[PDB]
Amino acid sequence: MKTLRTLKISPNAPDINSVWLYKGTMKYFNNGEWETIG
Amino acid sequence: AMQLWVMEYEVTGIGKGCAMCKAINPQQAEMLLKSNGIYNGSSYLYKVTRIEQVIVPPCNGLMAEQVVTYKDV
Amino acid sequence: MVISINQVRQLYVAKALKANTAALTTAGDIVPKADTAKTTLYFQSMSPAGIVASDKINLKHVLYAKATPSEALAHKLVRYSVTLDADVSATPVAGQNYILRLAFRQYIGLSEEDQYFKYGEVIARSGMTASDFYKKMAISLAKNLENKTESTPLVNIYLISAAAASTDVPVTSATKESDLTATDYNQIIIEETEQPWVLGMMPQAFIPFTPQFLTITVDGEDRLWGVATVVTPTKTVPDGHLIADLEYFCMGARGDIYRGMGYPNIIKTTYLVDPGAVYDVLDIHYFYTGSNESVQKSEKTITLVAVDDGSHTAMNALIGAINTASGLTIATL
Amino acid sequence: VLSPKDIKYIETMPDY
Amino acid sequence: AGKLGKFQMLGFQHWAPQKATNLMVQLLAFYRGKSLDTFLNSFPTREFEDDNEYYWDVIGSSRRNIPLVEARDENGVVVAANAANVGVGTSPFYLVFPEDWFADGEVIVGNLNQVYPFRILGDARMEGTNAVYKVELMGGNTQGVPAERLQQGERFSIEFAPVEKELSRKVGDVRFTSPVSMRNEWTTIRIQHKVGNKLNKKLAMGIPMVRNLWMHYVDWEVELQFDEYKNNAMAWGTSNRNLNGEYMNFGKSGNAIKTGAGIFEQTEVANTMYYNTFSLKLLEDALYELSASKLAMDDRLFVIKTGERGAIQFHKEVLKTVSGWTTFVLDNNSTRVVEKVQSRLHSNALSAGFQFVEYKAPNGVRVRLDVDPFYDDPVRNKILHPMGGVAFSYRYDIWYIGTMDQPNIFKCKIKGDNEYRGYQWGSAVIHRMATLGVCVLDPTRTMSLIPAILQG
């Protein structure tokens, strides 16, 4: 359905089409909210 | 046209805000925001939480502080 | 309202039933006259300009005679109940756009190739329930449809409270969601309206519709979000705009075929049918066969209307007077 | 150079 | 997203050394008035003989199918929705229509054409206005038609009128139709001003917010602000009549103030939708269904007219639609959002920027875009939008749907000079008066998407 091709290492927020990496936490955007992975 | 009023408010569900008016009393300060603000067609979303006057004799100090967190959103 | 004929058709309004030729005084009176040998039937009526007679029905040359009540000519306004589809999701899923497309079929013309579409759109929220969805859907429908600057009222929108389940809560363009305070809504009724009417120039016609849906992605799959079924009709269109149209046509077989055309230089026909009353219609159909070689029939008919209030008291007296004079067996409605 | 429409403007216009 | 006030306009009742210029400065920290002259003159004009209300011909279409009212079995009992099969074994039954449309010996079909064909056995027997045909099936069908395909609201068209090859008698008949008409009205406007060259009592000064905070030409301002009277009456005017033809408002001298609807109250009788958030799920599926029934495939060009911020709401929403296209990978080779701009700072110096100005839907529908600068009016449009603007810029207006060979929108006009002028020396009052009117012929060819905060 939704493809995310990039992964951005940032303490601040990436855009809605990029995957958030911060210090050990992987976050991604679905259903309007940034969901953690773990 | 007498006093200055800084406002800390919170638009309901949309975000938070910081505003400043010039009126005589704080009830008219919420009038000049709910009718001249950027949410004119959704003036019921404005929820004003704190009104304090801009008083002079310090003249070096904060008047409004309202941060939106990644954990509030 | 132009109608089709086998051959000529004459209408007489029956406002009051008398029993004698000399008693026909008020405009709208009628006496069904016949012989004692029961070979000829005709209707002496009082016009606004004197007493007139009908055509002389030969009672051997009658084909059929039936009387139609008022509730058989009532147009049942169709309704469509829009619910959320149970198999997709009983609860509105968050972030998806719920757009409904009302598909009209006869917008200004007489044909379906002239179509029209009005929409309504709702994006759902995270804590939106089913009853809060129909509150915001029918407000978004009535904001598009029933504006004050529109040309004609097309459909009426009604919610149903689940506890009441029989009373329509109407929504207009002026209706706010502050006034819709019930917490249990289960369907949105979309119901067509009564189109405008002026006698002879604009007939009583309707614009049918069908509520159609767009697709939403619930679990990655494109599903259309609701179902729209046709429930039983609850309102009826009264008979008055059809019979005042029907007299306007059959007052040209008797009198003037030129109605109003060269406007100051006309014959003005005065009609005795009020368009604010329902009517019971009786159409006695008959013909004429010539003497020796003119065996081809002239199939004509005579129409009679009579107003009822509740129970049919005036037409069942008129059928009883035609039966006791001519000797037919017209069924009493 | 005046077209007939222009003579019509110089006409229908008033003389009032 | 927050506004900071850069000016304040105050009335004069609430309040010479050398100059650095002889031309009066006009700041960018001041809103300015907007003419509707670029919007109104985009439409042609039309000349009439007099100030009578005018009508024209309206032509429709012909191809009809009659909806069914009820269906009855051979004894007169009406078929219910849960009844059994009707007309089993080619047994006759009745079919009650609100008009006499079909004839003897003709084959008509329900919602399912050619599957259940009904043959009409005789002329229409009138039931008041209803027409009752005793029909029987014409398909070799032994089990009859289901009861759901014989209910109220089913369309019935005609197919043919077949006979047997020998000794047969006459069947079928023919049908005719007619057109309609539509009218429109006029409106007259009047102005005055008690006046030489100097201001009068309705004054307003503008003071700008900077850090450490002549002579009027009356003959130009009365013409300008009566031009704005005829620009707001042509475009933003309304009608005050009944459906009985009566007027609702009476003037000073007892007579009724007659007004006609402008552009925006005639084009908003059809194809008008009120949205709260713009989406290409809504605009594409409303522009297709308008073009699926009315427009040929080559002639499906829609030029969206919008404001300034309605262009950036169309930019960031196509970009939402395009970024969900997981099939295609958009490169800088073809789209060129980053190109090579010659600069002194570097040999290979780059740039950035793009905007989606067009969208192309399937089946040939192309959605263009352009900016009309009169949507950004600070005087008239006063309800603000949170993303910047005045919330009227977010209104999308599609003019000119299809081709007509005549203009659909024009401004009516009396031949010659329908404007009046007059001076009243006592008091010195300059009176001016003018009549006007804008006719939209077919308002089905104008589509509008208005934001939901501008309604009700």
Swiss-Prot record, chain A:
Where in the chain are disulfide-linked cysteines found?
none
User: Out of the domains of life, which is the source?
Assistant: Viruses
Entry's localization field: Virion
Coiled coil regions, renumbered to chain: none
Q: What does this protein do?
A: Forms short fibers at the surface of the viral capsid.
How it assembles, according to the record, is: Homotrimer. Interacts with the major capsid protein.
**Protein name per Swiss-Prot or TrEMBL:** Head fiber trimeric protein
UniProtKB/Swiss-Prot annotation, chain B:
Keyword tags: Disulfide bond, Virion
Which terms in the GO cellular component ontology are assigned? virion component
Q: Where in the cell is it found?
A: Virion
Query: Where is it mostly found?
Result: virion
Q: State if Disulfide bond is listed as a keyword.
A: yes
What does the annotation say about its assembly with partners?
Homodimer; disulfide-linked. Interacts with the major capsid protein.
Q: What is this protein called?
A: Portal vertex auxiliary protein
Q: Which organism is it from?
A: Bacteroides phage crAss001
Swiss-Prot record, chain C:
**From which organism does this entry originate?**
Bacteroides phage crAss001
Keywords (A to Z) from UniProt: Capsid decoration protein, Capsid protein, Virion
Q: Does the keyword Zinc apply?
A: no
Keyword flag Ribonucleoprotein:
no
Protein name according to UniProt: Auxiliary capsid protein
- Where does this protein reside within or beyond the cell? Virion
Q: How does it assemble?
A: Interacts (via FD region) with the major capsid protein.
* Biological role stated in the UniProt entry: Auxiliary capsid protein that forms an outer layer on the major capsid protein protrusions.
- Entry's Gene Ontology cellular component terms: viral capsid, decoration
Annotated domain remarks? The central region FD is structurally similar to Helicobacter pylori flagellar cap protein FliD.
Q: Where is this region: FD?
A: 75-237
Swiss-Prot record, chain D:
Kindly list the places in or outside the cell where this protein is found, as annotated in its UniProt entry: Virion
Q: Where are the transmembrane segments?
A: none
Superkingdom per UniProt: Viruses
**Subunit and interaction comment:** Homododecamer. Interacts with the Cargo protein 1. Interacts with the major capsid protein.
Q: What does this protein do?
A: Forms the portal vertex of the capsid. Probably involved in head assembly, genome packaging, tail attachment, and genome ejection.
Q: What is this protein called?
A: Portal protein
Full-protein positions shown: 253 to 268 of 806
